[PDB]
């Protein structure tokens, strides 16, 4: 996705392809109640003593 999205304009790819490929998702405040949300990709999804180990989403 980063490779297709870096090469946008030089090809037709866009944000809506991340949506359509199921990579990113619009989450409502009322649905944000139920997410188990990470704050960076790596740093929160590594292996330690466990915080959750059930993350559903990450911040952009």
């Amino acid at each position: 996705h980063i490779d297709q999205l870096k090469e946008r304009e030089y090809n037709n790819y866009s944000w809506q392809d991340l949506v359509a490929s199921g990579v990113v998702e619009y989450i409502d405040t009322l649905e944000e109640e139920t997410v188990m949300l990470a704050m960076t990709p790596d740093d929160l999804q590594e292996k330690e003593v466990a915080y959750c180990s059930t993350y559903t989403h990450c911040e952009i």
């Binding site: 297709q4 090469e7 090809n11 037709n12 790819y13 392809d17 359509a20 490929s21």
Partner: protein
């Protein structure tokens, strides 16, 4: 001879399921009418492959620009089911673990008429 050769296209890019033949083609169709005729004067196909791993689908000098994105709700087998055998003789081929993500587009137009009319009539006498 077998590879990823399945190709979804939108409504406005609907290619004929059969080769072009003069005995199968007819004149029925006509900004309004501009989009109408395109359905059969364009839509045999050559999916051109590029050094970046993108694909371009050509039915003219117009281009559809394509990526071989994965699929997970549609994990079928593709097969040429021709009516010949017992009840459609499906010949085996590629499995639907990927399908095209790609861009094919349209446009709109503009209008203009009038606002209100005259008034203040008066009968004789």
């Amino acid at each position: 001879g077998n590879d990823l050769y399945f190709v979804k296209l939108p409504n406005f890019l609907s290619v004929e399921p059969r080769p072009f033949d003069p005995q199968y083609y007819e004149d029925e169709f006509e900004e309004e009418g501009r989009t109408r005729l395109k359905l059969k004067v364009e839509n045999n196909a050559r999916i051109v492959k590029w050094s970046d791993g993108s694909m371009s689908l050509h039915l003219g000098n117009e281009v559809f620009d394509v990526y071989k994105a994965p699929l997970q709700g549609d994990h079928n087998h593709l097969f040429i089911r021709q009516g010949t055998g017992l009840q459609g003789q499906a010949v085996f081929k590629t499995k639907l673990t990927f399908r095209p993500h790609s861009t094919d587009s349209a446009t709109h137009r503009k209008m203009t008429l009038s606002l209100a009319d005259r008034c203040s009539k008066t009968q004789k006498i």
